[PDB]
Structure 1
Amino acid sequence: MPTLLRVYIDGPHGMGKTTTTQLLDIVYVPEPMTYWRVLGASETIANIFTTQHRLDQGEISAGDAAVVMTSAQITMGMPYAVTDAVLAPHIGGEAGSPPPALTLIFDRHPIAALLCYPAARYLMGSMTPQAVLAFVALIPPTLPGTNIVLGALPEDRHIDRLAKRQRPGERLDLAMLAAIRRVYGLLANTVRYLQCGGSWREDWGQLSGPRPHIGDTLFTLFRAPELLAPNGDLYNVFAWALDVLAKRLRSMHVFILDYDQSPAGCRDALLQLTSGMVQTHVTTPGSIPTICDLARTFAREMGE
């Protein structure tokens, strides 16, 4: 049965992910911009930044923003979730360490819309922490060969590169850039903490008193008081949400791509990364062409 290579390009936006994948038996599942601006709702990105902006100005309440933000993040992750669910049955077990018959490269993975954006919106005061754990609770199971490339880039360069490529309806928010860079850094540390033995239940005590300290993982974000009983204990619903998080994250293979360089560099740098990536068998002989059509149809209908 053929082998497949799934590579999800993710991390904070504005570093070049789009220019990196563009330049690069290898199919692309691009940014679903048309779903965001038209198919799913009208100009979803504009509603998002408009709402953050208005919360900052004091024109609407925290509760007002959180509702718009949640509804809006549902519409943003839709294409990812639906792509994952129809693709999952075609993914079989691991290959190991030879040749990939097909290489599927995506623009983002479902955890960007289910975990990272919402956690950042939480850090911006535009989303409740209970809403973020509900989305974490719905993160599709992590299949073999879930390779996710996250990016490295000094903030100043990142602001520069972000400023020149502002999406339709987007606003250049530096507080949001900081939030999103911090979630992704926490994300990378979290996978490492978990791969290394970390038990969030065993180290929880350290947030109020060889692997990253729990204070450097996404778990610190969930010490939020909306999730805590009067005696300070995390309610069990939330603890189970964190257990899922540990289980979904932990088996992902994380890869760091340095974006502080020209798009030729970024593009080859990315292809270099694939040698330590994990590949999988597909489950049917006709699994490759179905994946390609899925990829072609997604691109044609939603990525412009």
Structure 2
Amino acid sequence: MPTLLRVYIDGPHGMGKTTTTQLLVALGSRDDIVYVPEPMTYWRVLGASETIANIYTTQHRLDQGEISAGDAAVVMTSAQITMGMPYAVTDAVLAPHIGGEAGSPPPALTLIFDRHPIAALLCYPAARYLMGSMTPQAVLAFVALIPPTLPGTNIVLGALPEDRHIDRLAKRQRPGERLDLAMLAAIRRVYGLLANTVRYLQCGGSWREDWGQLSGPRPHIGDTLFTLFRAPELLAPNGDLYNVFAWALDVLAKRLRSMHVFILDYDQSPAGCRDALLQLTSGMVQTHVTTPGSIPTICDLARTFAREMGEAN
């Protein structure tokens, strides 16, 4: 019974995630470790034209009063569907090979993913909602479509002080990307709330039970993603969420509950980050594969994906 190890490096953009993972896989540790990069090519060419630029341009026009929140929201929703498509399809074809968790024993193969489907289906949409370019109903429409959490989903979020983050973000300016410190703050808050949510849920938290507290290491409901959904549009006349929206939140809980989040401190040398990531890896949960041919298949998928959609390695 060979084991597989999957690690998802996520968190706000411009933090050193791409740099640190490339160093991690740069150790040339044979085939037992494959890195899956961001589908930059899908975003810029295959899925639609310059989607990242479309996003930043759209937020800007909205900020300058050149378009309405309505038009911003519609373009943003469509852009986010394009951003997460390759993440969703990969997770979807990978599901049939993931078996139960096998504790924490060298894994036959290790996959280092650059971001998890939730970045495009939950984290960015939620952040844009805070920026006024997305509606709460849309964010929840994405939440309701988050694929079931597979066993062994180890997500590595990041930690870096705002000032040191801004500096890094200022250096790395992607194609069609515009510096937006507001968006940066919004995304930083969303990811923090996410981490608090996993914790909150794992400590026996039940959002339905704590909801009233909102009205007015132990996170409370007010420090979780659930706060973002006290929006007036979602509240029924009796001051309670419409059931459709309540169910979506139920699904959100079901999805985040079974994830293993790890916090990597990016406030150090790139090599140092690589080491800490490598170290952190030892404590991550592994899983068994459903077929003997699964390992080779999974390795091929990852290689193909990287080759066809990676802007580079």
TM-score (norm 2): 0.96
**Deviations for 1:5-49, whole angstroms, at most 9, x for unmatched residues?**
000000111110000110111001101000000000000000000
How far 1:97 moved relative to its partner? 2.9
* Residues in 2 aligned to 1:161 and 1:122: alpha-carbon distance in whole angstroms: 25
For residue 156 of structure 2, give the secondary structure of its aligned residue in structure 1.
strand
* Residues in 1 aligned to 2:217 and 2:188: alpha-carbon distance in whole angstroms: 24
Aligned residues of 1:196 and 1:210 also touching (Cα < 8 A)? no
* Residues in 2 aligned to 1:237 and 1:8: alpha-carbon distance in whole angstroms: 30
How far 1:167 moved relative to its partner? 1.1
* Residues in 2 aligned to 1:31 and 1:266: alpha-carbon distance in whole angstroms: 19
**Deviations for 1:142-184, whole angstroms, at most 9, x for unmatched residues?**
1110000000000000000011111111000000000000000
For residue 226 of structure 1, give the secondary structure of its aligned residue in structure 2.
coil
For residue 111 of structure 2, give the secondary structure of its aligned residue in structure 1.
strand
C-alpha distance 210-254 of structure 1, shift in aligned 2 (>3 A): closer
For residue 281 of structure 1, give the secondary structure of its aligned residue in structure 2.
strand
For residue 93 of structure 1, give the secondary structure of its aligned residue in structure 2.
strand
* Residues in 2 aligned to 1:160 and 1:210: alpha-carbon distance in whole angstroms: 29
Aligned residues of 1:30 and 1:107 also touching (Cα < 8 A)? yes
For residue 227 of structure 1, give the secondary structure of its aligned residue in structure 2.
coil
How far 1:210 moved relative to its partner? 7.3
**What's the counterpart of residue 108 of structure 2?**
101
**Deviations for 1:79-100, whole angstroms, at most 9, x for unmatched residues?**
1001000001010011113211
Aligned residues of 1:198 and 1:211 also touching (Cα < 8 A)? no
Identity %: 100
* Residues in 2 aligned to 1:129 and 1:166: alpha-carbon distance in whole angstroms: 29
Pairs aligned (count): 304
**What's the counterpart of residue 140 of structure 2?**
133
* Residues in 2 aligned to 1:40 and 1:279: alpha-carbon distance in whole angstroms: 32
* Residues in 1 aligned to 2:269 and 2:192: alpha-carbon distance in whole angstroms: 22
**Deviations for 1:210-238, whole angstroms, at most 9, x for unmatched residues?**
72111110000000111111221100000
**Deviations for 1:121-142, whole angstroms, at most 9, x for unmatched residues?**
0000000000000100001101
How far 1:262 moved relative to its partner? 1.1
* Residues in 2 aligned to 1:196 and 1:75: alpha-carbon distance in whole angstroms: 35
Bigger shift: 94-103 or 214-223? 94-103
Q: Indicate the RMSD between aligned Cα atoms, in angstroms.
A: 0.8
1:156 is aligned to 2:167: no
**Deviations for 1:41-88, whole angstroms, at most 9, x for unmatched residues?**
000000000000111000000000000000000000001001000001
How far 1:289 moved relative to its partner? 1.1
**Deviations for 1:193-212, whole angstroms, at most 9, x for unmatched residues?**
00001110000000012721
Q: 1:245 aligns with which of 238, 249, 252?
A: 252
Q: 5+ unaligned residues in a row in structure 2: which ranges?
A: 25-31
For residue 149 of structure 2, give the secondary structure of its aligned residue in structure 1.
coil
* Residues in 2 aligned to 1:106 and 1:166: alpha-carbon distance in whole angstroms: 22
**What's the counterpart of residue 7 of structure 1?**
7
Aligned residues of 1:94 and 1:280 also touching (Cα < 8 A)? yes
1:19 is aligned to 2:19: yes
* Residues in 2 aligned to 1:172 and 1:65: alpha-carbon distance in whole angstroms: 18
**What's the counterpart of residue 213 of structure 2?**
206
For residue 233 of structure 2, give the secondary structure of its aligned residue in structure 1.
helix
* Residues in 1 aligned to 2:68 and 2:45: alpha-carbon distance in whole angstroms: 27
Aligned residues of 1:94 and 1:144 also touching (Cα < 8 A)? yes
For residue 300 of structure 1, give the secondary structure of its aligned residue in structure 2.
helix
**Deviations for 1:251-283, whole angstroms, at most 9, x for unmatched residues?**
100000000111101101101111211000011
Q: 5+ unaligned residues in a row in structure 1: which ranges?
A: none
* Residues in 2 aligned to 1:231 and 1:91: alpha-carbon distance in whole angstroms: 44
